[PDB]
Structures are given as structure tokens and as C-alpha cells.
Design a protein around this ligand. Sequence first.
Ligand SMILES: [Mg+2]
Ligand SMILES: [Mg+2]
Ligand SMILES: [Mg+2]
Ligand SMILES: [Mg+2]
Ligand SMILES: [Mg+2]
Ligand SMILES: [Mg+2]
Ligand SMILES: [Mg+2]
Ligand SMILES: [Mg+2]
Ligand SMILES: [Mg+2]
Ligand SMILES: [Mg+2]
Ligand SMILES: [Mg+2]
Ligand SMILES: [Mg+2]
Ligand SMILES: [Mg+2]
Ligand SMILES: [Mg+2]
Ligand SMILES: [Mg+2]
Ligand SMILES: [Mg+2]
Ligand SMILES: [Mg+2]
Ligand SMILES: [Mg+2]
Ligand SMILES: [Mg+2]
Ligand SMILES: [Mg+2]
Ligand SMILES: [Mg+2]
Ligand SMILES: [Mg+2]
Ligand SMILES: [Mg+2]
Ligand SMILES: [Mg+2]
Ligand SMILES: [Mg+2]
Ligand SMILES: [Mg+2]
Ligand SMILES: [Mg+2]
Ligand SMILES: [Mg+2]
Ligand SMILES: [Mg+2]
Ligand SMILES: [Mg+2]
Ligand SMILES: [Mg+2]
Ligand SMILES: [Mg+2]
Ligand SMILES: [Mg+2]
Ligand SMILES: [Mg+2]
Ligand SMILES: [Mg+2]
Ligand SMILES: [Zn+2]
Ligand SMILES: [Zn+2]
Lengths: 104, 85, 52, 50, 245, 81, 58
Amino acid sequence: PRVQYRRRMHYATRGNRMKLVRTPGNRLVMQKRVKRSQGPHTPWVLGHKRLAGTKALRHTEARLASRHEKSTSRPYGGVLSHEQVRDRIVRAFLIEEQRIVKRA
Amino acid sequence: KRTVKMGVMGRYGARYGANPRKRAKKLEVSQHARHFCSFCGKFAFRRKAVGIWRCDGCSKTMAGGAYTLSTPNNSTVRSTVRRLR
Amino acid sequence: PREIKNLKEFLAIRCVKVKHNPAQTKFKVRCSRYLYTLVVADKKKADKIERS
Amino acid sequence: GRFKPLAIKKKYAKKLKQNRPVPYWIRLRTGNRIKWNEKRRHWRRTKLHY
Amino acid sequence: GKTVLTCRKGNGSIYQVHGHKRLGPAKLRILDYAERHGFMRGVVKTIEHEPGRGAPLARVEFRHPYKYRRVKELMVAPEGMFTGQSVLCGVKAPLAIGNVLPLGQITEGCIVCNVEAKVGDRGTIARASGDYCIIISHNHETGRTRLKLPSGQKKTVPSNCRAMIGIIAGGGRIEKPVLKAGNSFYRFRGKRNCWPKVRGVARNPVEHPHGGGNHQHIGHPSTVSRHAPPGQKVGLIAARRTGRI
Amino acid sequence: TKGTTSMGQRHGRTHILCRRCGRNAYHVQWERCAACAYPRASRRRYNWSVKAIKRRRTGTGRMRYLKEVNRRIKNHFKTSL
Amino acid sequence: FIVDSNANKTEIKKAMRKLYQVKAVKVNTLIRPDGLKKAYIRLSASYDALETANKMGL
RNA sequence: ACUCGGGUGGAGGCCUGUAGCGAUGCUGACGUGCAAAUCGCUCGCAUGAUUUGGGUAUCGGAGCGAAAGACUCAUCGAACCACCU
RNA sequence: UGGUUGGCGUAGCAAAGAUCUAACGGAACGUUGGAUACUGGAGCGGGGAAGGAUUUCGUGCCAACGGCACUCGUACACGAGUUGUUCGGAUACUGAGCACAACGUUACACCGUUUUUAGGAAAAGGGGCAACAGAGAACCUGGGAUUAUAUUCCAAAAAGAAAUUGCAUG
RNA sequence: ACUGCAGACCGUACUCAUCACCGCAUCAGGUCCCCAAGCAUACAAUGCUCUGGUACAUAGAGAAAGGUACACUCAGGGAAGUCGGCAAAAUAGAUGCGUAAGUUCGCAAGAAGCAUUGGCUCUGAGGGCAACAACUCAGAACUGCUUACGGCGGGGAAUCCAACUGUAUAAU
RNA sequence: UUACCGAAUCUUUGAACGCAAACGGCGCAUGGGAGAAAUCCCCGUGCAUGCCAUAUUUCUCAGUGUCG
RNA sequence: GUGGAAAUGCGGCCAGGUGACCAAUCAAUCCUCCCACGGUGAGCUUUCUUUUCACCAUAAUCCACUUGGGCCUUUCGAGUUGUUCGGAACGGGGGCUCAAGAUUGAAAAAUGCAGUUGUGAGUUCUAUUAAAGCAAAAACCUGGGG
Ligand SMILES: [Mg+2]
Ligand SMILES: [Mg+2]
Ligand SMILES: [Mg+2]
Ligand SMILES: [Mg+2]
Ligand SMILES: [Mg+2]
Ligand SMILES: [Mg+2]
Ligand SMILES: [Mg+2]
Ligand SMILES: [Mg+2]
Ligand SMILES: [Mg+2]
Ligand SMILES: [Mg+2]
Ligand SMILES: [Mg+2]
Ligand SMILES: [Mg+2]
Ligand SMILES: [Mg+2]
Ligand SMILES: [Mg+2]
Ligand SMILES: [Mg+2]
Ligand SMILES: [Mg+2]
Ligand SMILES: [Mg+2]
Ligand SMILES: [Mg+2]
Ligand SMILES: [Mg+2]
Ligand SMILES: [Mg+2]
Ligand SMILES: [Mg+2]
Ligand SMILES: [Mg+2]
Ligand SMILES: [Mg+2]
Ligand SMILES: [Mg+2]
Ligand SMILES: [Mg+2]
Ligand SMILES: [Mg+2]
Ligand SMILES: [Mg+2]
Ligand SMILES: [Mg+2]
Ligand SMILES: [Mg+2]
Ligand SMILES: [Mg+2]
Ligand SMILES: [Mg+2]
Ligand SMILES: [Mg+2]
Ligand SMILES: [Mg+2]
Ligand SMILES: [Mg+2]
Ligand SMILES: [Mg+2]
Ligand SMILES: [Zn+2]
Ligand SMILES: [Zn+2]
């Protein structure tokens, strides 16, 4: 069993990964291995971490995914880690409370 | 394992000459040493490109010197700003 | 190829391919999109819908 | 390889059906001069580099 | 003869700066009204390495003065400019590291970086790593402060000129020996086709004024005139003295 | 190895056929023709090579319309109503 | 069919429908190495490709 | 005071050596050749200033060169084409 | 410039190990069987790019060509052959880059910047191009489907099973 | 959800190489990518083998001199040969020992230098999961040698030069 | 059939000009066509830039230009 | 819109993310290979051979649902082959979630094949030098706000 490419492209680049596959017909057949992307992340300046409620959908299928598959139902849900939201909810509240005090 | 004398420089073998290794060795170690973080109180800084020091603890990035987190020149400026305060 | 499991749905649902198996009897309902199948273990109820 | 603009395929197509022996009946005309095709091409010799 | 390599670098063909991976110009914020009558707080977002450059560049994110949008902006970082730091650019910015405040308002004797010579030009002096310039005088009556350029060189500039506070980061690059011919291969990978530097005496008589001859030697003084035409102005140019000092 | 062994090193094309002249003179990398000077509007034409001016001048082709307008000038553009 | 080389598939369906009065379930054309375009049009099962081709003088 | 064992780890324009890139020697074969520069064995580098496809940029009183006047389509101490001639 | 010549039936056709056998074919090297080796998975393997562009396939042919021979051929002649919603490409990315426009310069645009002293929106920074190895990218197998194409062909039990885009429909 | 209709353009054969490209050629040269078995072995070295491919490189007879060789062998001597150890031979794997000057303390170093190694029948060691799995190392007898594949460094002492790796006159 | 010439026909391009272009690619607008459960598909015509004229029922505008 | 104490589950502009970027290694599957077993076919068969060889296949798509990481919660050790880590929350119990993966099944035995699993190995894919820090962008996504 030696295999050859089936899609018109023939280079071992990262976007052209292939999977060897024994078939029902007992052929051994290369198949395109999907170009998996890492999923949604909290922003790079906030340490760039993978989000919890969100799937690493390729945008090729992200359009067809349910909205909540790419988010949590929290404010900034598809954008920020829960701690990052809570950092703000505190920082919004506490900073305004000092400003409200600087009028006195 | 340990070299009698040249440590990180041991990788260079018998070349580049003794002094230049001696002088590369100081910068080479402070460069890969973990430098103290005033933010965390933690040894934590590690360089990630010349003049860039990521903090392993809290995500953060001091600017800093090339082979060292702080230049001796910088020691002056910070207090000198503190005194102007 | 989704597989409808309960009968109530399947009786609701073009030309259908019955397939007897040893220890089975599938009912492969073809449709515009999916080939729905309804597995049916004991035969006493297999022709119970086959004769439908 | 596979790649061809159709414009190149039309040209090799052109030269391909142009690559034919003269019709037998053309030689039988009065005052005929032609015998062999003087513009027969062979892929292993002249190149139509397109 | 034939065109000298000093002259060919002026075609700037092969000899252009690389910079595909360069982040863009590293400048100060546009001299807004806010700079001229207050201050703009921008938080530093991330300190980058610009390839081919020694100093890290910072990514201060100022909010846009006139519209709802936020304006990330890139300037070579003063040392000690950590991410999340809130920079304060403007005339009545507080005097601290990373703050960009009018040069005539910076205290005499304090050291500044990324100084701008012309007002509003967005920071041209003291930008290389480790570099800075002490303010050595103000002249409030004529509104022109002096300062000492990173080269031992005094210069007068208007106090309306901005400067950043502190040494530029990444200082001490040059102290580390390069050792390998390959190590200097990469510092110039991100710079330009500057390197390796073939000696002109090693070149031919067509190639260089110094080139050619049996023993490889310059035949005439290496100290060329200022008025020497290009292709001739090689060797030591308009040198006032030669020799080790 | 500047001879037959470096003839194997040469793999590309400098020129593909031109959209105008049909010459294999279209420098694909400098998208222009060495022959017609295409895409430049005015076609390439030098007096130091009249063997080439002659080679591609009018009458070299069908003169598809020019035959029609020549016949007409000869016939005073005589016309049916 | 050799079919006009500039014609596309949908036009070849509409043309079979009009010339030979028959539906084409599909029409996958190729252009021949020679430069002619060649359609393999498959008829709907309701239309025989045999009864029609012989009606066509073939 | 920070040294002596032992392991760990996998560094290096590190070593031996494939592939690949070269090309020292035999001044071997060939030398109207397989070849208008090749063949053989030997040999050198082979984690790097490496090799390599595609693309792109820079050329003729010019380009490009870790510099041999090297290379710039078998053409270079000034390509090739046409022309003056 | 054409033709011819001696040398001369000479120098050679000595790199990579290899053929043997029978039967048949044929006017006389092929074909099959057997034997024997070789390649030896960085292959005289199976697919592609560039390049080539009919070389493919079948039948015939073997005049010429295949530096010996051919019954055979990548040769010759004739007839065939390449099938896609999903492969690749374009539609539809940007990149080193390029350059239309404008503007400027030039005796002259065949130059330069690449935005334009600049009113670039037609319902803040003009238009475009530039990657078949980068980004993007909805399809799979089985076939008894060819002389030659198949992730392309298959027919109503679509061998079948999908995903997907547009519109529309309950 | 469903269903209905529709899903357009061009590529698509073959080649990709000691006969399909470039080299005036079916030219021993050159030419990017992918898949890549078994055994020995450290192995993509090398040898060999199933599969897939080949049997195409003009053949025959016989075996003058002189040649070419990716062929050997040579008594005694052992570089006397020669300009020159050129070429050849030689070293060789692994293990255990042992390893000098000099040194930038990294090295030099595989320094150098001895030594053991097959076969066979055994032993020992080294783990997993609960309440069977390796395959290396080690040892021991017995026994064998014609020292018997392939592959695999010759070494040392000094002087000159250049520090080093690198580049570089394609074709002296 | 020949000769000539009025009517036409004159495909893709090309100054090439709707935008591109190793793409027989892609538009916007207009009319047509086929067709079809509209979407798709074919077709015609217009659609480059510059400049001059004109807005003949005198187009819409811009200027801290001049005034009113 | 909505469940959940929480991690989170289900149902114009603006900012962020995907695109998006590393040798190796480790691990899982993949694949190939080997072995054991069992079947089936073939072959050897002077002798010997419970034997040698071959084969024993499982596509995308979908549906139900162990390893590595992140996190929630609750009441010096932890950790890797390895250069770590911990009150800025380690470990333990329960939970969440991502990424692979397993198995259940639909496809799908009406196919393949020809007259079976499991087990081992390899392959596969998912720090260092650095004065080197190792593309962009459309598309798309999610949010904040409306
Ligand atoms: Mg071509
Ligand atoms: Mg010289
Ligand atoms: Mg000179
Ligand atoms: Mg000197
Ligand atoms: Mg000198
Ligand atoms: Mg040359
Ligand atoms: Mg080249
Ligand atoms: Mg097609
Ligand atoms: Mg090395
Ligand atoms: Mg060596
Ligand atoms: Mg010289
Ligand atoms: Mg002879
Ligand atoms: Mg063999
Ligand atoms: Mg043939
Ligand atoms: Mg022919
Ligand atoms: Mg660009
Ligand atoms: Mg493009
Ligand atoms: Mg791609
Ligand atoms: Mg595609
Ligand atoms: Mg085929
Ligand atoms: Mg093919
Ligand atoms: Mg190949
Ligand atoms: Mg040729
Ligand atoms: Mg091997
Ligand atoms: Mg080998
Ligand atoms: Mg002897
Ligand atoms: Mg001697
Ligand atoms: Mg002697
Ligand atoms: Mg003598
Ligand atoms: Mg020798
Ligand atoms: Mg010693
Ligand atoms: Mg040297
Ligand atoms: Mg040479
Ligand atoms: Mg046009
Ligand atoms: Mg499956
Ligand atoms: Zn810190
Ligand atoms: Zn042209």
C-alpha cells in the first residue's frame, strides 16, 4: 500500500495535511485532513487564552453553528474570560465609586 | 556535567576566544536568568526578544534592557522621577 | 443518514427500503434529504409495519 | 501538466488539427503543386512552446 | 571604472530596508489639541520586538479625541514601560516614565527619550535602544530648552517640543560580543543588505578607489575630501583627524 | 557547468504569447511584450530594424477593413439610396 | 453532442429541450483536446435516449 | 565560604555520516567524449552564514558580488539583438 | 554555394551486471507459458508541478525514424479518448511586488511618486493586479464503469450516502 | 424543520524522464513535490527480498599484445620508488580499560594504547494489570575458528599560513 | 460560374474603451429571451480617460472669491 | 430569549477573536508493520512441516454519548523524560468546559472479499540560537451598544 494525492494539490504544506484511510473497498486512500483552527480566545493583550464556552469551529462551519456554540450567555460571552468580565464589573464599579467620592 | 569555568559558553567549544566568551557569558546569563518582578515580588521576568521581558506570573511585559531587566542608567531615572514627585 | 428510533415518528414519514437482517429488520425510508432508518428487533412487529 | 488557459488549449487544439497529411484528392487537381504537407509538426521535434 | 558600491546603495534596490515584518513607524501621538491643552491617557497594550530594531516598541492605545473609536498607536518604549501601564501624553501630563509631556515642562537635568526636534514631528531624537538625552537648560523667556543628544552633543529645541521620560528600553545590546559571523547574519537579516562588508582593498581597481594593486593597499590617503564626487568619497570622509585617539 | 548541465537548470518562461502580436514575447514578469511593447498603446517600432518594421506593417495581415475602404475611395463611395 | 464551445451547460439543457423536445437531467460538457466542446447530456428517465437518438436519424 | 560523586537534560555557524549541496585528489576515465565540463572512486559541508520550488526586485558606459574582474541564458576586463557599418 | 571523395566497411556502436526455453505469430522480432535474474520503497514503482501538448488509447502499420534488428515502438496512418454544485483555478484574500488614474517631470512619457496642492462616497485616505505550494476551499465511498476518464461516469431501489449555495415552499 | 427547483465558467488524456522537459538527440548531464514494505543493522548506510516493475540499453565466437576497471592476488624486502607515500595498502563495528603534550580549560580525544567479541545450552537482572507483556544488559558453562559478508577512523611528532564554521575564479 | 459593386454580414481581440486577464473570467444599468420552482442562464445596448460644446423647456451644485 | 450558586448550559458603529504562523518530544488515534489466535484460500509435501503464503475490508456524513488542558465550586507540597509550579490558590472531593479519542448505533453489508480480534513496535499528526523572536488580509465569528 503506497498512497498518492487525490486533490489536485501535491505539497506537504500545513494546509494540505492528509489522512491515510483503509476503505470499505479495502483501498488505502489519502483524505484531506481538516485544517483545524484553534477557537475563540480572549484578546491577546489579556493573555490570549482559549474561551471556555466556545468551540474551535472553522469559519467554514461557524456560519452554520448555533450562536451559543461560539459563546457563553454572559456579557462579553464570546469575547472575555469570566474573570476578565469580572475584572471590569469591579473596575467599572470601583472606579466610578472613587470618582463619585472625588466630588467630596 | 559542569564546566570548570564557562557554563553557558560551553556550547561554543574551543572557539571565539576566551575573553569574548567571558564577556558574552555575563550578558548570556542575565539574559536567560529570571529577573525579579516588583509586580509579583516573584522571580518571574524572562526575556522574549531583546529589551522585552515577559512576566511568567501575571501576564505582563516590562521593557527593560537587553541582557538585563534593568539598565544601570534606568536606576537613576526612576528615582529621579520619584524625587520630582 | 440519520436514524429515526421510535415508531411514532416513522409512521408519520418516498419509496422505502425494507431490509431483513439476521436478528434485525431495518426500514430504510428514503426522502429528499436523509435516508431515515427504523431498526426493528423482534420480527413480530417488523411485518407489523411492513404490511402497513 | 493539467494547467492550460483555454486560450492555449485552443491553440494547441489549432495546431493539432492542423497537423494532418494533405488530403489525397488535393494532389489530383489540375496544376497542383503540393505533395507532402510542408508544415507537419512533431511534438518530439518542433516545439509549439505555449 | 565601474560603479562603486557606496553609490549603488543609493539605487536602493537590493539595498533597501527589509521591514516586511516591521510594525510600522514608531512615533509619538499626533500633536492633538488634547496634547496641547491637557493630556491623553493611553494604556500600553503590548511591548513588541520590531525585527531589525533594538528597542522594543510599545502599543499604547489612546482613545480617539474626536470620535468613538480607539486609536492604538506605536512608539519605541522607554525602559520600565510595562503592559497595562497608563501613559499620559499632553501638556499637563504628570512627570513620570513613559509620559510624553512638553519638553519645556520637563525638569532641567531629567533624562528624556524619543525627543522631537521640530515641534509636532512625532519624536525623532533619542530613539535607539539605551539612548536618552538629558535636558540641560530651559530658557522660558525665549521658550527654547537645550538638551544633550545621545551623542555628546548639545542642541536647542522649542519647549513646545514633546519628549518621553526615561531611557529607551533594550539598552546594552552592543555590549554583548557577536562572536559568530552567523550571529551578525541575523541582526542584519531584519535590517538591510548591509552585510558582509568586503574591504575595498580586497576589491578590484574598477570596483573601488582603494581596489587593485599587487599588495592590497590604498595608494593615496584614505581621508577623502568633502567635495569629492560620489564614487570617490570612500575611505575616511572629510576626516578632521585620523589615528587612534 | 555552464553548458549542457545548466541547460537543465532553466525551467520557466520569460515570455508567453502576447495578447496583441501573438508573439511569444510577452515578458510575464514585467507584464509587457518585447515585440509589440504591449500593453503600451503605441506599438513598438524601430527604424534601426526595418526588416522588422516591414515584417509586421500593414498589408502583412488581412487588411480586413482597409480593403473595403480602399475599394470605396476608388468608387467615390458610390452608394445605393 | 459536439456543442458550441462557448455554450454553457444550462444553455445546452435548454437547447435539447427545444431541438429534440426532451429533458436533460444533466449535461456535463467537456471541451475536446481538438477544441470542440462535447456535451454528454443524460436524459430524464421519462425520456429514452435511445428512442430519441433513432428519431434523430442516428 | 561552594565545591567533589551521580544522574537529568539536549546545547552547539559541535563531530562521524546519509539525502541534498559541493568538488580535494587520482593531475584516474573520457578527451573528434555519454557530455561544447561528463564518468568513476576518493574527498569536503551536511542544525546551518544550510539546501531547495514558486513568486518578486536589481542589468549593460549597467546590474550583482563573503570580491574570483566572478556572474548577468554555452556570450563578460563591459550581455545579447539590430542598426550606423 | 552545391555535389562528391580518400581515409573506410574503418574508428567505433565496450558506463548500469541477463537472458534461457517451448509454443505460437510472422514473408522472416513480438505474444504466452515456464525458467532466470534484476530494480530493491531516495525503486527502470505510484501520483503531481514546470515543461511538453496528443506523446494517451485501439486498430493497422513498419516506407522513412527508433545509430543492430523488429513481426514491436513515444514512429507512421486511421479512428477514438479527457465528463465535476463539492477536485484545482477563477467568481472572492492578501504578500514580496506592480502599475492605471491623477499629478508632476521630460524637447517628448515609452519616467516617477503610487495616491492626487486633493471636490476620487452615486445609493477620511481613488481603481486594479500580484500565490494552481501562503490564506481560502460544500463529497464520500462502492462499482461488473472505458481500448483510453473518473473523488468528474453510474439512474429510480440513482450503488448509494452526504454536505453545500441561491431562490422558493409549506 | 421540511420540501421544490437550480447549482454556471475553465483545467481534467499522457508525461514528468538514463526514450515524453532543458541540453541541436530516445544525450550516462540537469530538473520541485508526495507515498515508500521485509530481513540483517544503530541505519533511509550496505547487502539482499515480497509488492509494483524490469529483462531496455546491439549481438555472436573465442579469450594475442596494449589498455579500461566502481577487479583481485603476490615469495623476500618494506618507500630503496617518486618531485612528493602519488596511488594502493592500512585503520575500522561494539564493550571494557587507558589516554600526552599543549590549552582560550571547552578541549586536544576516537588522542595514543592494549583487550574481549562466534556457536550453543543456561542462569540473573530489568515491568504491567488485576485477585499477561517486552528486549535489552549481565553472567556461565560447553564448544568452534580457515580469524572467514556488508559496512566501518590509519596514527603520531613538528614547522608555515589562516583563528574558527563559512565563501569563492560555473568550464585548469 | 466568373467579373465587378452600392446592400448587408463582419466571431475573439486590438488604440481597445465597463473591470480585469497565461481567467475564452467578471460587473452595474438597460431591454429582450428561455425557463422555472423567483433564483439561475443566454442575448443586445450603454458604461474608459481627457478635452471642447451644451444644459436651448437653460441641469444640480461648491467657495470665511465679489457683491447684494 | 433562558437554565445553572458558579465554571457555564439551552433556545450603523465599536471592540475582540478565528484567519495566524516552532524544531523536537511526549500522548492519543491514524496508518503501516509484527506477533498471538481463529477462520478461509493457496503452496510445499523424497523426507520432514498442528506447516509456509495470501486474505480476513469499513468511506464521508450524522446520532447518542478516555487522555490533555482551562476554569468553577467546595474542604512545604504538586509535577514532568525534561529545563516547573503553588495564598496572584497547590493539592482532595464534586462540577464545568475545550481539544483530541473511545465506544452505541445510522451509513452498512443490498458493499468489499474470497471461494479475526487482540497484541506489540515504528510512523503520524496535535525548547534552543536570538543584537534572529520567528507574514498579511478577505472571509467569518462573538461581543459592547444600539
Ligand atoms: Mg504550456
Ligand atoms: Mg582581488
Ligand atoms: Mg578608480
Ligand atoms: Mg593586508
Ligand atoms: Mg593593506
Ligand atoms: Mg554563462
Ligand atoms: Mg536557477
Ligand atoms: Mg468540467
Ligand atoms: Mg555541524
Ligand atoms: Mg572530517
Ligand atoms: Mg586580479
Ligand atoms: Mg570495427
Ligand atoms: Mg536485487
Ligand atoms: Mg501507444
Ligand atoms: Mg504521429
Ligand atoms: Mg503590497
Ligand atoms: Mg488575487
Ligand atoms: Mg493554497
Ligand atoms: Mg475548489
Ligand atoms: Mg490512466
Ligand atoms: Mg491522470
Ligand atoms: Mg515522478
Ligand atoms: Mg529534447
Ligand atoms: Mg536500507
Ligand atoms: Mg541506499
Ligand atoms: Mg610482496
Ligand atoms: Mg620515499
Ligand atoms: Mg627517496
Ligand atoms: Mg632514486
Ligand atoms: Mg594516498
Ligand atoms: Mg592535560
Ligand atoms: Mg581559513
Ligand atoms: Mg575552477
Ligand atoms: Mg477591455
Ligand atoms: Mg466511517
Ligand atoms: Zn510580574
Ligand atoms: Zn506582444
